[PDB]
Amino acid sequence: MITAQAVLYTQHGEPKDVLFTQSFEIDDDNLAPNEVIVKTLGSPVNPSDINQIQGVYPSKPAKTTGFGTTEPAAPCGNEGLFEVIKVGSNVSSLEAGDWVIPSHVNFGTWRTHALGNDDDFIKLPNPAQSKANGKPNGLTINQGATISVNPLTAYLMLTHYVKLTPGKDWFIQNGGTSAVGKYASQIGKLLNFNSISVIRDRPNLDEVVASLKELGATQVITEDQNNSREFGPTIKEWIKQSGGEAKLALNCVGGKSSTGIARKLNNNGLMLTYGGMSFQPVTIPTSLYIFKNFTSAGFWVTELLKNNKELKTSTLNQIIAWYEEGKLTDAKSIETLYDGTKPLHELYQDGVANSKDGKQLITY
Amino acid sequence: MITAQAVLYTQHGEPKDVLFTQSFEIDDDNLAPNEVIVKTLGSPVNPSDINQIQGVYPSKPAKTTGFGTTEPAAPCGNEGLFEVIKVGSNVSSLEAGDWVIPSHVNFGTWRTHALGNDDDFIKLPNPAQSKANGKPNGLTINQGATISVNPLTAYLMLTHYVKLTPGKDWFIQNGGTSAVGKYASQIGKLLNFNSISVIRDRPNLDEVVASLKELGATQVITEDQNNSREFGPTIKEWIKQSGGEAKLALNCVGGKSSTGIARKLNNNGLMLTYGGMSFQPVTIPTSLYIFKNFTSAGFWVTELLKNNKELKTSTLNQIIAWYEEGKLTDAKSIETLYDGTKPLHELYQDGVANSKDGKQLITY
Ligand SMILES: NC(=O)c1ccc[n+]([C@@H]2O[C@H](COP(=O)([O-])OP(=O)(O)OC[C@H]3O[C@@H](n4cnc5c(N)ncnc54)[C@H](OP(=O)(O)O)[C@@H]3O)[C@@H](O)[C@H]2O)c1
Ligand SMILES: NC(=O)c1ccc[n+]([C@@H]2O[C@H](COP(=O)([O-])OP(=O)(O)OC[C@H]3O[C@@H](n4cnc5c(N)ncnc54)[C@H](OP(=O)(O)O)[C@@H]3O)[C@@H](O)[C@H]2O)c1
């Protein structure tokens, strides 16, 4: 008989307002033949998780009484890393000790345990298994807990929409310091795509520029350079010299930033909007559409991979392989350990409030 | 020897400031074997013509001294209807009396005459020729003079990008009172597309609404209604109750208007931006891209048809056929006749100044 904790809400709103923690019990002695019990190792706070609770994200778990509430309640969090604790009599694809992520969104990963069927999960190698398998590296908890959204998002935006000629063509991305952006820089490096990362200026600009170039940005500019008519020819020359074109823009900021990166594409450019961190709309001069044949589209990993297990699997497999080979590193998280002294929902509330500090991971 | 008149400018700027009339001589007796002389029958004042004169349009005729000026000067106007006055010895694609339009932009149509080669012109049937061909109608001067831009633009936007299901699907367009808008409404009716036209409010709204519905708009709303969150569900009902979807948005306004019509599309909607009458940029909420898989693109008839003679021909032929069959009517022009007493440039300056009154056509 396991006592678990889950972060719930019964009504949408700001996480600081509507979240609470619900204790509930899992009976490890009553597993159906295809059922599995998992224990959470870590799960991040993503913007989508927050948007989901706020009610402005049209993919969400049902509100149910399943965690022992009287009011229907929804769990929180869409990705995370779990460890298999026990499996039913008919489960052969998972065993105790295995690492898994949810196979689908809306599973609720802001909680200590879960009961599910074996097909609710996708197996990741644990570090012991990686090492036994002759890999130079095993996954860290943060790498496994964050493998399913941001790395896939970067990979798919860079490969699924426009073919960049290796060693020649460019993508331009804003939110250069974001977790997605750091994955995008690395994957650009691994696939030999040139890239410009746009970041907000900061006192240690030089340090951050150096870090992003190491990850794999070709050039790094500030949003002020992004805004600059004067600086524009600098960017054109970079591209001219490469013999390639700027064919793809990645936008998770909106507002002026989206305008700026759109302007820097060659004619017949494509922008994918995948976030709006500024809360400002995507703003594009009429002339880009008419005269430069700019196209502005969206990207939603959840929808793309909704009914494409094949694409999810091969992408996820590539990310796993890169980690095991040491070719990819994670967007690092600020980690907060749950030990039962402070209610679980307060840790996540803190993670939401502190997300400005950088990606937050709640660990167990 | 023919004495002609051309509207020119030596320096870019507002038409009211920079235009003048230049007399020039055309020799009707010494034509090269491929050369053609034409007499202008009518030419309209279009936004792009003004933008060229203003120097804010990326495609413009070269400044030249060929009209007999000291300073180099450019001609004005991109479309018009001409009558063939005389052809060279090797010309067999055109005869005297034939009706033609320019085959390419930047021809300079704000003038009485032109000398060019036969391939500078595209033949339309004159009313004699339509009659002899058994059509119930021949083209009018305004229909010929304005056939080459706005109706091709409306047709191509409606048919070249997304397939609307006849009798079911919708497009939504702003600038509903524009010439292009009025063509689109009719072409929508002819192809059995449902549509919403968004227009600016005005004293005679009821009359304008009736007029556009007569042309073919299924529904007409004001920009206020376009902006209204409360009115939104009413528009969604129109589309849902028809059994179709709103798949296409046509934008020539920009700004809040572009936002509003984008919001009315179903998932996987496409917006085509073909103008920016508000001078505000195309503004799209991030959520439409991510969650509605909205796409925003451009339309420039000049670029699209620039190397697609077959598509241009097919479209032009259909527009001609509908006029001939009496199935399509022109967006009406306010016509100013040049009798040679008032300087030609003054007629066009007036046309420009009065273009807010509606499409202006100078006739000869
Ligand atoms: N569509 C999808 O499928 C999908 C999937 C995953 C993620 N996303 C989106 O990707 C974006 C980043 O996600 P993440 O997980 O990588 O988050 P993250 O690690 O927390 O990074 C947040 C980023 O936003 C920047 N930022 C914050 N406020 C800003 C502002 N007002 N103007 C400009 N930049 C601002 C931050 O830059 P600073 O360092 O300067 O503060 C940082 O780069 C989010 O919009 C998220 O919703 C979308
Ligand atoms: N990209 C291409 O290939 C292409 C081809 C043809 C035309 N166009 C563009 O299509 C547009 C219409 O051209 P047209 O020849 O049809 O001109 P038009 O007949 O003169 O129509 C002008 C339209 O603009 C509206 N308008 C004017 N000022 C406005 C403002 N501040 N806000 C909102 N609406 C405003 C007018 O509405 P009101 O009645 O209320 O005044 C009217 O609907 C222009 O932008 C033109 O440049 C583009």
Side-chain angles (χ1 to χ4, degrees), chain A residues 53-318:
Chain A
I53 298 158
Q54 292 168 329
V56 302
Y57 189 86
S59 175
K60 63 192 193 185
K63 299 178 191 61
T64 82
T65 58
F67 295 97
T69 61
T70 55
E71 272 282 310
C76 303
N78 295 273
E79 72 177 325
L81 178 67
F82 303 80
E83 187 181 28
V84 174
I85 290 323
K86 190 170 178 174
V87 308
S89 59
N90 196 37
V91 176
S92 304
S93 65
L94 303 169
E95 55 195 22
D98 284 351
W99 280 13
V100 297
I101 55 174
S103 57
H104 296 101
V105 291
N106 298 337
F107 181 74
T109 63
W110 295 5
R111 51 172 162 147
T112 55
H113 301 74
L115 174 74
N117 299 124
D118 50 354
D119 50 46
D120 288 328
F121 302 103
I122 293 167
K123 183 179 164 189
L124 298 187
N126 67 33
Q129 287 157 343
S130 298
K131 297 293 182 56
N133 200 22
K135 306 311 188 183
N137 301 277
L139 293 166
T140 65
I141 298 304
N142 187 57
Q143 292 166 0
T146 61
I147 200 175
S148 85
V149 176
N150 286 352
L152 305 206
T153 291
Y155 191 87
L156 289 163
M157 287 192 296
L158 282 178
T159 56
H160 196 61
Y161 294 90
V162 59
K163 186 182 300 178
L164 313 164
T165 301
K168 276 192 170 185
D169 290 329
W170 296 70
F171 66 98
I172 300 176
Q173 67 169 335
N174 54 24
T177 58
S178 72
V180 178
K182 290 181 281 190
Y183 287 122
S185 294
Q186 296 181 81
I187 293 167
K189 184 188 54 196
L190 292 165
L191 300 177
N192 197 23
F193 297 161
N194 298 318
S195 68
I196 301 167
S197 285
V198 184
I199 62 172
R200 298 198 289 181
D201 196 358
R202 55 243 292 146
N204 63 330
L205 182 64
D206 301 327
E207 286 185 7
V208 175
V209 162
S211 297
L212 296 178
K213 285 186 173 181
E214 283 179 354
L215 289 172
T218 313
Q219 302 289 355
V220 181
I221 70 182
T222 64
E223 285 291 358
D224 303 297
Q225 288 166 322
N226 195 27
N227 290 340
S228 172
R229 195 171 188 94
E230 204 82 351
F231 191 80
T234 295
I235 295 174
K236 295 190 197 65
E237 187 65 6
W238 288 342
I239 297 159
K240 199 107 173 181
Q241 295 299 275
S242 70
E245 296 185 346
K247 291 184 178 171
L248 179 59
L250 311 178
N251 168 50
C252 66
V253 172
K256 284 188 184 71
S257 180
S258 69
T259 316
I261 70 173
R263 290 198 126 115
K264 287 156 183 57
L265 301 187
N266 283 76
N267 299 349
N268 312 316
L270 173 67
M271 160 169 291
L272 302 175
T273 287
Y274 70 100
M277 293 301 299
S278 73
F279 294 94
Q280 288 298 108
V282 180
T283 304
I284 306 295
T286 298
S287 61
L288 288 194
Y289 289 124
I290 303 183
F291 300 136
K292 279 197 162 294
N293 192 37
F294 174 72
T295 294
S296 188
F299 176 85
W300 191 14
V301 68
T302 295
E303 180 64 25
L304 180 62
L305 302 180
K306 179 167 183 174
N307 296 327
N308 204 340
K309 287 134 285 296
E310 186 167 335
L311 183 56
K312 175 150 60 193
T313 293
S314 59
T315 309
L316 184 63
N317 283 348
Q318 175 65 92

Side-chain angles (χ1 to χ4, degrees), chain A residues 51 56-58 251 253-254 273-276 280-286 289-300 303, chain B residues 56-58 251 253-254 273-276 280-287 289-300 303:
Chain A
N51 288 160
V56 302
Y57 189 86
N251 168 50
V253 172
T273 287
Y274 70 100
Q280 288 298 108
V282 180
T283 304
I284 306 295
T286 298
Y289 289 124
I290 303 183
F291 300 136
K292 279 197 162 294
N293 192 37
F294 174 72
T295 294
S296 188
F299 176 85
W300 191 14
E303 180 64 25
Chain B
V56 301
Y57 194 88
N251 171 49
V253 177
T273 287
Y274 67 105
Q280 299 300 309
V282 180
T283 309
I284 301 298
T286 293
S287 65
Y289 291 112
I290 306 176
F291 308 135
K292 307 285 287 173
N293 194 36
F294 177 73
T295 300
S296 190
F299 181 87
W300 190 13
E303 185 59 31

Side-chain angles (χ1 to χ4, degrees), chain A residues 290-291, chain B residues 45-48 51 57 149-150 153 157 174-183 198-202 223 251-253 257 273-279 298-303 331 355-356 358-359:
Chain A
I290 303 183
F291 300 136
Chain B
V45 179
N46 293 325
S48 44
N51 291 154
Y57 194 88
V149 182
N150 286 349
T153 288
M157 284 188 299
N174 55 27
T177 50
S178 72
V180 176
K182 290 189 274 187
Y183 286 114
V198 184
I199 64 178
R200 293 199 292 188
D201 204 345
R202 60 201 65 215
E223 285 291 357
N251 171 49
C252 69
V253 177
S257 180
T273 287
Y274 67 105
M277 294 296 302
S278 78
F279 306 101
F299 181 87
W300 190 13
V301 61
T302 306
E303 185 59 31
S355 279
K356 68 189 189 305
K359 186 59 64 177

